[PDB]
């Protein structure tokens, strides 16, 4: 299946309370592998997945210096944006940056990303094909022109289409035991008497990886959405994910409903039906 | 831009000293170099961010700190004669073009004995009548002698204004005694003007030599005047003859 | 992959007017930028030009640098060279991927552009101290650029290197050297060279 490497950066100004907070997190697919937190005591980029620990001191020293340079740049940006938008230094603002790359099943580059946001809204991003910038407003236009004068877009692409893909491949290989794993969902169905005329059927998918999954209900062989509830896919806290779909059905008509589960780890989609 | 201070300094062996370096360009990167005369730039320490520092090629004997984005001081823990060199601070963005911006430099001289510090004696030698009669031009020569260390800035002033045209100063001062480590120096410069300009008695020529020596707090109980940082100059006035 | 910057030629001595080509080669093509500086004796570094893999050329007056197609070399061109161009030209590159950000400098190209002396009149004059006619220095001036002054051949006789001055208002350049000594037998008639 496809893969991706993503870096997420969050910088928050903290008016008169020291330096802004800077947090950096790297993922490969749905697996976090590194982190940096300006408030943490180490002041080091740290491993969060087992396979990355095979990288040597040179890698950690370099990633630490780079993320620190990143922290400084974002710290300056907070002051610059405040200026662009003529905001006060007493207010807390947030800058977020995400960049990374996607590869197909063959591990060949599919697309890259470099997006920037100020206070939760798009500020400036590189377009889908990476060949131009999208600027939200005049403040972002100012950044856009500075970036086009420094050929930042071409600097980023060299990385997104090369370096980024190269490191993603390296990590996929080094952490093959877990990154290229496919944990099919453990499934089951529960039943609850809701009332004098209703019963709830809950279809569970658990301990699955990657996070991408599809859970759907059907009644009499037809897609069922009425009186259904589907929760956002969530992390179990052990590297795997969980998700469920429930439907309220008339008492006694339980077996006319079926839950269907599609996940990469399943050679075939599973179908669950209530067996009392 | 990048501002380094001090530009010149004389230290006694064992003294501590801090060179300051500031920049107002929000450059994430700041660095210090030392360059011995005629040799290459050698990185001492650098910094990519506040509270982040890294050693360069020659970190021994030096400490740095990065408390703010603007400042990157260099501390000489215990001055040694081997630390006599020209120190340069350079900063840049860690993005954009990454262009390096250098400070003006800081010439440091560490000595065991400050009594070897001497200001220059300055003299202006007037144009020869033979030069004037042969070329219709007139060359004044300024000679600065007996100074140590080699920390001087020589400039020509004509009628209260500094001049650059018609002037050439030796690229480097010569050691009066090459085999002596603390040999005093000499430096010369020439200012050439037309015979007409030299023959006008209203024209005032002044060779100024800014010498950088001992600081105000340095000890001095020798018979001769304390060789402090000062301007020593010599002058000549035009003359019909 | 350790970056190594090589500059050729190491030294360059030419007559003014000549077009110059300085080279700066580097072993690691993964560079973020390449920057040229000039450094004059006893002075600091002045940045001249800055080029990158995405802005491969830059021009500044009679100077223009380019980052060659051979992803490991830069050439600095100095058109119609002038004596004011005399200096050590330094080139530095910054790393694109090593995460150190440390620039690597070349050893530099020492350039001396000699002034064209159209009408030489080599001569050694004696100049008197404006304060005391007893003290004097010897001035060797107006010699062509093919002439060079030899250093202190005697322990008590001091001779300076040649020095070029430019009287801009009358577009006139000239070479000179100075000599002095506090000797009794010292005279300007036999103070210069051998």
């Amino acid at each position: 299946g496809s893969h991706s490497m993503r870096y997420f950066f969050t910088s928050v100004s903290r008016p008169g309370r020291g330096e802004p907070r800077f947090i950096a997190v790297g993922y490969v697919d749905d697996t976090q592998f590194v982190r940096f937190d300006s408030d943490a005591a180490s002041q080091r980029m740290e491993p969060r997945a087992p396979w990355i620990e095979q990288e040597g001191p040179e890698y950690w020293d370099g990633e630490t210096r780079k993320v620190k340079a990143h922290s400084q740049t974002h710290r300056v940006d907070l002051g610059t944006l405040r200026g662009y938008y003529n905001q006060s230094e007493a207010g807390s603002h947030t800058v977020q940056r995400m960049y990374g790359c996607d590869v197909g099943s063959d591990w060949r580059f599919l697309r890259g990303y470099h997006q920037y946001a100020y206070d939760g809204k798009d500020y400036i991003a590189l377009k889908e094909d990476l060949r131009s910038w999208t600027a939200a407003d005049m403040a972002a236009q100012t950044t856009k022109h500075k970036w086009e004068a420094a050929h930042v877009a071409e600097q980023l692409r060299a990385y997104l289409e090369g370096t980024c893909v190269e490191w993603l491949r390296r990590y996929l290989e080094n952490g093959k035991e877990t990154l290229q794993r496919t944990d099919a969902p453990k499934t089951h169905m529960t039943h609850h008497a809701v009332s004098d005329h209703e019963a709830t059927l809950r279809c569970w998918a658990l301990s699955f990886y990657p996070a991408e999954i599809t859970l759907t209900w059907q009644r009499d062989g037809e897609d069922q959405t009425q009186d259904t509830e589907l929760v956002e896919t969530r992390p179990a806290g052990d590297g795997t994910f969980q998700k469920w779909a429930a439907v309220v059905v008339p008492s006694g008509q339980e077996q006319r409903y079926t839950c269907h589960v599609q996940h990469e780890g399943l050679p075939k989609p599973l179908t669950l039906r209530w067996e009392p | 831009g990048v501002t380094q201070t001090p530009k010149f300094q004389v230290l006694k062996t064992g003294q501590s000293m801090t060179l300051q370096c500031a920049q107002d360009m929000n450059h994430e990167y700041m660095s210090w170099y030392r360059q011995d005369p005629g040799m290459g730039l050698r990185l001492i320490h650098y910094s990519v961010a506040i509270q982040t520092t890294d050693q360069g090629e020659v970190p021994n004997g030096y400490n740095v700190s990065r408390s703010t984005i603007e400042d990157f001081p260099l501390r000489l823990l215990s001055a040694a004669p081997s630390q006599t060199s020209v120190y340069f601070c350079a900063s840049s963005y860690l993005g954009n073009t990454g262009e390096l911006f250098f400070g003006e430099g800081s010439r440091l001289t560490v000595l065991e004995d400050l009594k070897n510090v001497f200001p220059p004696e300055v003299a202006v030698f007037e144009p020869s009548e033979a030069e004037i009669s042969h070329t219709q031009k007139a060359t004044l020569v300024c000679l600065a002698t007996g100074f140590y260390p080699d920390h001087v800035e020589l400039s020509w002033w004509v009628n209260g204004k500094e001049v650059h045209s018609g002037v050439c100063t030796d690229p480097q001062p010569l050691k009066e005694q090459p085999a002596l480590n603390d040999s005093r120096y000499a430096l010369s410069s020439r200012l050439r003007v037309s015979a007409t300009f030299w023959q006008d008695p209203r024209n005032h020529f002044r060779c100024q030599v800014q010498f950088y020596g001992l600081s105000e707090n340095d000890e001095w109980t020798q018979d001769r005047a304390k060789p402090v940082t000062q301007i020593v100059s010599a002058e000549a006035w035009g003359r019909a003859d | 992959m350790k970056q190594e910057v090589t500059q050729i030629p190491a030294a360059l001595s030419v007559p003014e007017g000549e077009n110059l080509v300085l080279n700066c080669s580097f072993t690691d093509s993964a560079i973020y930028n390449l920057q040229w500086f000039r450094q004059d004796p006893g002075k600091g570094l002045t940045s001249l030009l800055l080029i990158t893999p995405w802005q491969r050329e830059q021009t500044s007056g009679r100077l223009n640098a380019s980052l060659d197609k051979s992803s490991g070399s830069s050439t600095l061109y100095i058109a119609a060279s002038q004596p004011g161009d005399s200096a050590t030209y330094l080139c530095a590159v910054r790393p694109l991927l090593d995460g150190t950000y440390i620039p690597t400098f070349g050893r530099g190209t020492s350039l001396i552009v000699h002034p064209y002396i159209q009408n030489p009149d080599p001569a050694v004059y004696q100049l008197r101290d404006s304060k005391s006619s007893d003290k004097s220095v010897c001035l060797f001036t107006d010699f062509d650029s093919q002439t060079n002054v030899s250093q202190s051949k005697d322990s008590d006789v001091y001779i300076t290197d040649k020095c070029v001055l430019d009287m801009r208002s009358m577009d006139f350049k000239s070479n000179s050297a100075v000599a002095w000594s506090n000797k009794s037998d010292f005279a300007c008639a036999n103070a210069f060279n051998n």
């Binding site: 870096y7 950096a24 790297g26 890698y59 370099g62 990633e63 780079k66 993320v67 340079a69 990143h70 740049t73 300056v76 940006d77 610059t80 944006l81 960049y99 920037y116 500020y123 400036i124 950044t143 500075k146 970036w147 420094a150 930042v152 600097q155 980023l156 990385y159 370096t163 980024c164 490191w167 | 929000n26 963005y93 860690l94 993005g95 954009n96 990454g98 | 973020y32 790393p95 694109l96 991927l97 090593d98 995460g99 950000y101």
Partner: peptide, 9 residues
């Protein structure tokens, strides 16, 4: 591996 050079906005 992270980007090395990031330009201020």
């Amino acid at each position: 591996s992270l980007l090395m050079w990031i330009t201020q906005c």
